[PDB]
Scaffold this active site. Structure first.
Site, mmCIF file in Angstrom:
data_model
loop_
_atom_site.group_PDB
_atom_site.id
_atom_site.type_symbol
_atom_site.label_atom_id
_atom_site.label_comp_id
_atom_site.label_asym_id
_atom_site.label_seq_id
_atom_site.Cartn_x
_atom_site.Cartn_y
_atom_site.Cartn_z
ATOM 1 N N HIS A 187 0.815 -1.205 0.000
ATOM 2 C CA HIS A 187 0.000 0.000 0.000
ATOM 3 C C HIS A 187 0.860 1.273 0.000
ATOM 4 O O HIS A 187 0.767 2.102 0.896
ATOM 5 C CB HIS A 187 -1.007 -0.011 1.147
ATOM 6 C CG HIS A 187 -2.167 0.902 0.925
ATOM 7 N ND1 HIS A 187 -3.440 0.550 1.327
ATOM 8 C CD2 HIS A 187 -2.217 2.118 0.325
ATOM 9 C CE1 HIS A 187 -4.207 1.586 1.014
ATOM 10 N NE2 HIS A 187 -3.514 2.536 0.382
ATOM 11 N N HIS A 240 1.957 4.909 -1.460
ATOM 12 C CA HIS A 240 1.615 6.075 -2.290
ATOM 13 C C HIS A 240 2.974 6.656 -2.645
ATOM 14 O O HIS A 240 3.672 7.089 -1.728
ATOM 15 C CB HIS A 240 0.848 7.117 -1.466
ATOM 16 C CG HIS A 240 -0.562 6.727 -1.218
ATOM 17 N ND1 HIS A 240 -1.607 7.324 -1.908
ATOM 18 C CD2 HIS A 240 -1.062 5.784 -0.392
ATOM 19 C CE1 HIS A 240 -2.706 6.738 -1.460
ATOM 20 N NE2 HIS A 240 -2.422 5.805 -0.554
ATOM 21 N N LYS A 246 -5.459 -0.098 -9.095
ATOM 22 C CA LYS A 246 -6.114 0.329 -7.874
ATOM 23 C C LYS A 246 -7.460 0.961 -8.243
ATOM 24 O O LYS A 246 -7.506 1.841 -9.101
ATOM 25 C CB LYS A 246 -5.226 1.411 -7.229
ATOM 26 C CG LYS A 246 -6.032 2.186 -6.128
ATOM 27 C CD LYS A 246 -6.060 1.264 -4.968
ATOM 28 C CE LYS A 246 -6.694 1.992 -3.745
ATOM 29 N NZ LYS A 246 -5.692 2.965 -3.248
ATOM 30 N N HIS A 282 -10.136 3.278 -6.709
ATOM 31 C CA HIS A 282 -10.220 4.159 -5.557
ATOM 32 C C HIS A 282 -11.475 4.989 -5.675
ATOM 33 O O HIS A 282 -11.786 5.462 -6.761
ATOM 34 C CB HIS A 282 -8.966 5.051 -5.481
ATOM 35 C CG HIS A 282 -8.779 5.697 -4.146
ATOM 36 N ND1 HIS A 282 -9.630 6.694 -3.695
ATOM 37 C CD2 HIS A 282 -7.834 5.471 -3.207
ATOM 38 C CE1 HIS A 282 -9.195 7.014 -2.483
ATOM 39 N NE2 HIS A 282 -8.117 6.298 -2.147
ATOM 40 N N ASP A 337 -11.971 8.020 -4.851
ATOM 41 C CA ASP A 337 -11.693 9.395 -5.309
ATOM 42 C C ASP A 337 -11.715 9.514 -6.830
ATOM 43 O O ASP A 337 -11.915 10.609 -7.346
ATOM 44 C CB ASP A 337 -10.396 9.952 -4.709
ATOM 45 C CG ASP A 337 -10.454 10.167 -3.200
ATOM 46 O OD1 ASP A 337 -11.442 9.730 -2.568
ATOM 47 O OD2 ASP A 337 -9.502 10.746 -2.653
ATOM 48 N N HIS A 383 -10.397 0.314 -2.740
ATOM 49 C CA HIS A 383 -10.775 1.299 -1.731
ATOM 50 C C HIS A 383 -12.199 1.668 -2.183
ATOM 51 O O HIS A 383 -12.386 2.338 -3.210
ATOM 52 C CB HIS A 383 -9.815 2.499 -1.665
ATOM 53 C CG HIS A 383 -10.314 3.661 -0.837
ATOM 54 N ND1 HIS A 383 -9.437 4.479 -0.156
ATOM 55 C CD2 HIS A 383 -11.571 4.144 -0.674
ATOM 56 C CE1 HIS A 383 -10.178 5.419 0.414
ATOM 57 N NE2 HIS A 383 -11.471 5.255 0.135
ATOM 58 N N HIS A 428 -7.171 -1.430 3.641
ATOM 59 C CA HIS A 428 -7.735 -0.910 4.898
ATOM 60 C C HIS A 428 -9.159 -1.425 5.129
ATOM 61 O O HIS A 428 -10.101 -0.629 5.144
ATOM 62 C CB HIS A 428 -7.668 0.645 4.961
ATOM 63 C CG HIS A 428 -8.015 1.328 3.664
ATOM 64 N ND1 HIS A 428 -9.273 1.201 3.089
ATOM 65 C CD2 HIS A 428 -7.250 2.104 2.863
ATOM 66 C CE1 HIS A 428 -9.212 1.864 1.944
ATOM 67 N NE2 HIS A 428 -8.015 2.410 1.760
ATOM 68 N N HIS A 433 -9.643 15.882 3.957
ATOM 69 C CA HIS A 433 -10.870 16.177 3.216
ATOM 70 C C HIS A 433 -11.419 17.598 3.449
ATOM 71 O O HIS A 433 -12.420 17.964 2.824
ATOM 72 C CB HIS A 433 -11.938 15.106 3.506
ATOM 73 C CG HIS A 433 -11.603 13.758 2.950
ATOM 74 N ND1 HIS A 433 -10.750 12.896 3.614
ATOM 75 C CD2 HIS A 433 -12.021 13.165 1.808
ATOM 76 C CE1 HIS A 433 -10.675 11.812 2.858
ATOM 77 N NE2 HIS A 433 -11.424 11.927 1.762
ATOM 78 N N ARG A 458 -16.525 7.601 8.968
ATOM 79 C CA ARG A 458 -15.339 6.797 8.683
ATOM 80 C C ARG A 458 -14.545 6.394 9.939
ATOM 81 O O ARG A 458 -13.824 5.399 9.888
ATOM 82 C CB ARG A 458 -14.420 7.494 7.669
ATOM 83 C CG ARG A 458 -14.346 6.746 6.360
ATOM 84 C CD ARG A 458 -13.752 7.579 5.254
ATOM 85 N NE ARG A 458 -12.300 7.444 5.187
ATOM 86 C CZ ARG A 458 -11.561 7.822 4.152
ATOM 87 N NH1 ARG A 458 -12.134 8.318 3.062
ATOM 88 N NH2 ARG A 458 -10.243 7.683 4.188
ATOM 89 N N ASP A 461 0.062 2.549 3.820
ATOM 90 C CA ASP A 461 -0.782 3.609 3.238
ATOM 91 C C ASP A 461 0.115 4.863 3.369
ATOM 92 O O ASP A 461 -0.288 5.886 3.921
ATOM 93 C CB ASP A 461 -2.128 3.819 3.974
ATOM 94 C CG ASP A 461 -3.199 4.378 3.059
ATOM 95 O OD1 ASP A 461 -2.851 4.859 1.972
ATOM 96 O OD2 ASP A 461 -4.376 4.383 3.454
HETATM 97 NI NI NI Z 1 -7.490 4.073 0.457
HETATM 98 NI NI NI Z 2 -3.965 4.732 0.246
#
Ligand code: NI
Ligand code: NI
Ligand code: NI
Ligand code: NI
Ligand code: NI
Ligand code: NI
EC number: 3.5.1.5
Lengths: 101, 100, 566, 566, 566, 100
Positions: free
Chosen positions: E133, E135, E216, E218, E220, E245, E271, E319, E335, E359
């Site tokens: 995981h 980024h 992935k 996601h 978003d 995700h 996650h 966010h 969340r 993450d």
């Molecule tokens: Ni995520």
């Molecule tokens: Ni992530």
């Protein structure tokens, strides 16, 4: 003096002008909250939201881009929708359209 | 000591706060990097002491006031964030509007 | 559906008619135009616009951009506009409206699965700066310049050697080849300058054929009329630029003799004010001529209370003069003059001086070209008010005039404007993202050829990238083979034709210089003034049309103590 | 026209008969000769000599040098002379008089447009040092050694592994290949040593064919007569050097048995005094033999008040002995002896020990080979006075004898003297520039193969390179492809013939070792003494011709607390 | 001849029946087996075993190992055993008994002249960790992860851009190619994830053919049933993994709709607890399904007194929610839930969650995957006691279950278990050496592909490598061409077949992913539990077979303040 | 703080001066690097205070005397140069013969 400060012109901005709009009453029949984004194809939202799906075909929420409308369980509300533009081709979401309209 | 890169990086932050602490003691109005370093190092020592995240989120708002910094500095700092090793491991402390 | 202008600016950045203060200066820009359709702005994040079937389309990689900078406030020589910026294959693809043509109107920048997003709402985006007065004294200057917002560096040198400490010259084919090889390791675009001081043209052609994009004529190597004539003859044959640091001593002639040796041919005059070097005391009069492209070096910019003090004691260390000898103090009062230093700031404001540059570690500060350009613009607004060209209640024209000094004008002067120097379609995507409070001082992101090369970065082990300490760290655009793909080494046309890149096994992308001989003062964007300028040989007073040109020294400047730790 | 000798020395550096103190020691050198023509010295700068048509000529690049070091005071094994040094194609071109043959007399080093200048007036220039006892425990040792003035490093290892912590061995073809690949990244010339401890010759030939330039025989891998015999047989076939760390335990025999196993063949004895390892207590007697090239490692150099204390507690950590066990303390009083440590300094002064080296991070300090060599020379001058070979009122001969220990003699021992080791025409231009006040401690410039590779450098953003903080930073000669062109990887003749460089895709320049088997004690420059030496088995007293050899421990040394922050 | 067990453990490390405490935790491991022959243990050093004709043989390089780790205490999913480890050609050759077959019995790992030695007596050796995981926000994350004991990193990104700050996606062929080129510079094995959020399969096939080993999905970028279906169809065709995700907003459906869109196809749920993202509040129920491979990200591991506080104020920054808006606080309580955070620790202890991951800098700590995995195991031992699978008076089974979470299970999930993930014959020699007092916190040595790549290293100039300051520094395995030989870039089968490595001029060793579609929950080593799990939509209580699953928050943890400077 | 490389480099100079300041306080005679660091850091703080370049060029000559340094140190330092951010931006301070 504030570094990088804005001096914003007072007033209001009108959004999505000259486009077809409609209003629908939506009710969340699910037991978990649902939040819908500004550009999501409204007719293909979570099936727990009850409303006239035929009236919402080719429409999205008429709200500032990047904002959302939240529906807590049991919540009933009237929302204003705005027609999609460009080619008016819908691909994605729940895979109900996958082409023009 | 077997210092990891993160530990060495925090040494840089500690040193920048020593510069700020000595300038504050002389009665200078602190600038942007000095204010950030000073409040950040305060939070790291609070974590070493065993203070909670919720207590430092509040205590970090009383390290510097608007009268101890240069004009525009409070508005250049909407928040300060720093992580440190608490008794219960690494945690993130976010201090909203620390200078008022 | 309606939104207030204040809530709109907080979510998407300012729009038409809104004004922004540049850092802590007195300069305000006003948004002139906005290319969006209100309500169709693209925003990335949890539950936002850039998502499958929404603001992101179904197109293959060939039909969409690699990167989009959303809601950018562009500041460039051609306009101060709100727009999305699309980047594809490392170059600027379009300035316009991004999104998905399937559901959105007026989309000119398509977003697909192959698209990365940089959120630019509330940020200012400019082209990467171009410094044309680099002394390659050490490689560490590249990161310092990159961090400041400079993406291209033109200069000469071999490292910390006496020749390079004094001059921007990379002497001879062996050093030129070694420095071109070394350039592959640096995260900026590079072009080299050879030693132009020779009276035999073949010794110059050899350096051009080896890879230099220009020749520096420096008085420390003898800036005589015969060396100048020889360098310009070769420059005219090979389409390369000549940079001049003239005979301060008036040994071979006065400024009129240097100007006669030039004979109307195109030339770039370094540190035209003269503190950095040149005919004492009247090198500044060269800005009147149409074939002269005049630049300033930065320690004299702007004129401040400490300028002279640090400049009288700078010359005493560089040339080892000592205050005890009267003839050395008479020499000190010859290169360092209050009158030409005060006039230079005004000549920049009027557009008679067209470029700014550093003179890196040789009477110049590599990380302060941009910062000092903006300090001059601020000091000029404060003392002189609005420019004659200014429309509206803003400093837009002054901003366009000053940004051109370190972006488009150096590019035009060195024959590289076809690749870099401005945010225009087809040019390399060397872009700098600034938060308005740190404009010109500390950038938020430096993009080299479409990849982020350096950025402020917080704790590596943290749960997010924002926790302290935040300091500039090299990114993926500055590593190994990714760096080679994202930077340019500029070569002369003769070196490219002769296969110099293949012979030296250069790994970076190659670009060739062209149009160095046809550029003139009239081509300098917003800085084409040819004033009738005179310097009094006795008092050193600078006059334009008989009118005295002067300014007052600053005691405090913006973009200074509020931002820096030391 | 006349000038006083004091004003002359301030402008051009000292001349014939002038004396210079080396750092803060009691050593004085006297300029023996000066190759200039008084009045025709070349000086670079504003209004100086090196300018078009003056001290700089019209010749093409092929007819002039790439670099000139002007007015250098050379200190080398062959002389202490004032001269200009010319460098061309990365090699030493000439030692003589630089300038322009068009207007100047006796020019042997022509200066043209293709020439860079290093101003060496008032500086001492030496060859780069050569350390032949490197344990490759970490790559960071390369920069530490380079900063100290060492440009070539010969050793063995794979990183911080138990085998390498103890021995200079790169074991086997896979590790040899990986370390040769890694060497391209380091800014020093490198040669590797394989594991010589085996009684089957094919296991050794395999390592030589893979790329090692020598084999280390170490007692930790078993330094038995059969392993020694085997390694020397292969060395004689393949023209490579053998380095020995003998059987301290006297397990397989005494020193006379090791010497009989050697059988008059050429060998390099590491840490000949014995603290670093070897037959207890008489390994030191090997310096009497003609086929032995003896070196010292540096912690025992010079003998000081703290030497024993740090050496008794060093062996207790490395070998985990513990002071509670009597047999381990009896072992501690076996490798660590006051008598051999005090005698070693005198044996260096007499020329019976020919090389100095570190033993990097394995009972040795990588950045202190040069510094400690000069501290021994100082302590010997103070205790013993002038050498028998000394002429004049100066320490010139002692200086020539000691500089040979870390320059020419290691090069001759390892078969690399055709490339490096001295300032002679045709050799690689690995040069070190020193200010006299920092001689042997902190150099002003380190040149690798004709490019500056590392130098002290001030504030990157400053208007000049001298403002604080000044610290050592890598230069262009240490970057990417420029580094590959300016450094050498040494290979055995078999590896070069077998195309090892092409197979591994080695990017640096390659050189081949030769003449390892024919070098003998008589070939060691100014260090060819074969004394009749004995060690008493009971008291450990060292005698030469029945005369006791001893020295007193220093309480304070030069080149120490005046220069270092910690 | 006899030796006491205490003296034996001090010389050779523990043997069968001896117990070791892991760092400062309450976990104890017991040595299950010992592969030596008592009296024939190999030990390196002055007068020790590994010497010519003794523990070292006469074999050629082809007949012996390149490296031996002597007397290692192995901790792996298959056992806790005392053994020697042999490495040859950068891969694990054998786990057994090292030495010389000429004089020693039962030798399975031959030692010769070509063999390097790492002394592992008294140390624990594990496989290198695998974080799936990542980024790619900055390249500095690679060294931080390597120092912590992680040798493989799987993730996505282009640098500090909005898309990468939020998602593990490397979007499109141009960014994929640039990141594969950049990966050659990093000292860890790397595989990239593309942007999986699209409803057109060709936009996905293009990214796989460019080089990604997974996609992935996601929220978003829009985690809708159509995008999920499309990504899994391509994954099934191309033998790559999908990481999910999910739609936290329940915009397109609830968790049962996402699960129906998946349709029993193999997928990795990131996650799985949900704080890091996913259907609110019941994404955790996915661990009941056979086709789901569930991982945790580390800030929720273990549950502590400060977890919620730092997690409620983490979501408000990422966010930009602000505590003033009630609908954003209702989203914050959606969340971030105490009930699922407390249950996650128990689900790890029972084996219902199979992997741990970071993450990195996007609600995760890159240097804390291993450290936090062990803190969970400690907190679970303390609260729950021994596992049902546990035999003997030790925590061996719990240790095997937890080590699998960051070694073998991520490898199996991503189709790379044929190369890395465990200490097994034929796999790449990515090994981590730990002192028991620093187990899981600060390693003594990190080996990448058979070379030491990073290690704690003391003063470079010191007489030994142990003097202060000791800090992590890159070794030879992390330099230039040696690094390329010792690391892997993982590619999809389509990219390898299409010659992507040759086209991009990738310099590192290449490996291809396979078996991503056939892996299921039952294949997760010691973590194959499929519980009947429910989450109450109102209270968020987690139940397994109607039984409430909860745990108490820690106020103090081991592997924390005793070890770290800040 | 968004520290640039030049700001981080000056942190190194500040730290070296802390070492020197603590040794001076113990009554030691300062060596070459300690003396340079001490006088350099004094000038940087003077710039932060808003002192002029001409005042620091003179004040920098009275930080250390010949009696507070080791033999030969004054002659190893013919001048000290340092740049710092003054109210009017970066300026160079040159201190000639600082130790007498
Ligand atoms: Ni995520
Ligand atoms: Ni992530
Ligand atoms: Ni100049
Ligand atoms: Ni210059
Ligand atoms: Ni030895
Ligand atoms: Ni050694």
């Amino acid at each position: 003096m504030i570094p990088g400060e804005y001096h914003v012109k007072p007033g209001q901005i009108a959004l999505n002008t000259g486009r077809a709009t409609c209003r629908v009453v939506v009710e969340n029949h699910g037991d978990r909250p649902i939040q819908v984004g500004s550009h999501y194809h409204f007719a293909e939202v979570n099936p727990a939201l009850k409303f006239d799906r035929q009236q919402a075909a080719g429409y999205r929420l008429n709200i500032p881009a990047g904002t959302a409308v939240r529906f807590e369980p049991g919540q009933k509300r009237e929302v204003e929708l705005v027609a999609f533009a460009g080619h008016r081709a819908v691909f994605g979401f729940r895979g109900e359209v996958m082409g023009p309209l | 000591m077997e210092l990891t890169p993160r530990e060495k990086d925090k040494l840089l932050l500690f040193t920048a706060a020593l510069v700020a602490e000595r300038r504050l003691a002389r009665g200078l109005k602190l600038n942007y990097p000095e204010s950030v370093a000073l409040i950040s190092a305060f939070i790291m020592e609070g974590a070493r002491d065993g203070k909670s995240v919720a207590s430092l989120m509040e205590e970090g708002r009383h390290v510097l006031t608007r009268e101890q910094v240069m004009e525009g500095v409070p508005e250049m700092i909407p928040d300060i964030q720093v992580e440190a090793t608490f008794p219960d491991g690494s945690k993130l402390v976010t201090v909203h509007n620390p200078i008022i | 559906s309606n939104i207030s202008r204040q809530a709109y600016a907080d979510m998407f950045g300012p729009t038409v008619g809104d004004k922004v203060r540049l850092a802590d200066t007195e300069l305000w820009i006003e948004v002139e135009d906005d290319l969006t359709t209100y309500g169709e702005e693209v925003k990335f994040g949890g539950g936002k616009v850039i998502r499958d079937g929404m603001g992101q389309g179904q197109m293959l990689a060939a039909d969409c951009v690699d990167l989009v900078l959303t809601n950018a406030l562009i500041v460039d020589h051609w306009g101060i506009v709100k727009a999305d910026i699309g980047v594809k294959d490392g170059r600027i693809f379009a300035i316009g409206k991004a999104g998905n043509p399937d559901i959105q109107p007026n989309v000119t920048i398509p977003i697909g699965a192959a698209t990365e997003v940089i959120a630019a709402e509330g940020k200012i985006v400019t082209a990467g700066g171009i410094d044309t007065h680099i002394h390659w004294i050490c490689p560490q200057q590249a990161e310092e310049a990159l961090v400041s917002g400079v993406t291209t560096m033109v200069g000469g040198g071999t490292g910390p050697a006496a020749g390079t400490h004094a001059t921007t010259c990379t002497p001879g084919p062996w050093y030129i080849s070694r420095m071109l090889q070394a350039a592959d390791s640096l995260p900026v675009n590079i072009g080299l300058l050879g030693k132009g001081n020779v009276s035999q043209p073949d010794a110059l052609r050899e350096q051009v054929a080896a890879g230099v994009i220009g020749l520096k004529i420096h008085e420390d190597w003898g800036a005589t009329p015969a060396a100048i004539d020889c360098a310009l003859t070769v420059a005219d044959e090979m389409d390369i630029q000549v940079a001049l640091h003239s005979d301060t001593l008036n040994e071979s002639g006065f400024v009129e003799d240097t100007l006669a040796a030039i004979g109307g041919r195109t030339i770039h005059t370094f540190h035209t004010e003269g503190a950095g070097g040149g005919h004492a005391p009247d090198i500044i009069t060269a800005c009147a001529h149409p074939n002269i492209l005049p630049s300033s070096t930065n320690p004299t910019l702007p004129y401040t209370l400490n300028t002279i003090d640090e400049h009288l004691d700078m010359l005493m260390v560089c040339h080892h003069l000592d205050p005890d000898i009267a003839e050395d103090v008479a020499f000190a009062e010859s290169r360092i003059r209050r009158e030409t230093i005060a006039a230079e700031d005004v000549l920049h404001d009027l557009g008679a001086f067209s470029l700014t540059s550093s003179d890196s570690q040789a009477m110049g500060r590599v990380g302060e070209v941009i910062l000092r350009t903006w300090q001059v613009a601020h000091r000029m607004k404060v003392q002189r008010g609005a420019l004659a060209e200014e429309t509206g209640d803003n400093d837009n024209f002054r901003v366009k005039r000053y940004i051109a000094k370190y972006t488009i004008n150096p590019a035009l002067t060195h024959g590289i404007a076809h690749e870099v120097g401005s945010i225009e379609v087809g040019k390399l995507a060397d872009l700098v993202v600034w938060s308005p409070a740190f404009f010109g001082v500390k950038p938020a992101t430096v993009i080299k050829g479409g990849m982020i090369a350096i950025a402020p970065m917080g704790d590596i082990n943290a749960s997010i990238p924002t926790p302290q300490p935040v300091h500039y760290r090299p990114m993926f655009g500055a590593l190994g083979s990714a760096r080679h793909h994202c930077r340019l080494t500029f070569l002369s046309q003769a070196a490219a034709a002769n296969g110099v890149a293949e012979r030296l096994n250069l790994r970076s992308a190659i670009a060739v210089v062209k149009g160095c001989r046809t550029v003139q003062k009239a081509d300098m964007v917003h800085n084409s003034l040819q004033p009738n300028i005179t310097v009094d040989a006795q008092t050193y007073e600078v006059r334009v049309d008989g009118e005295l040109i002067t300014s007052e020294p600053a005691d405090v400047l913006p973009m200074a103590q509020r931002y820096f730790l030391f």
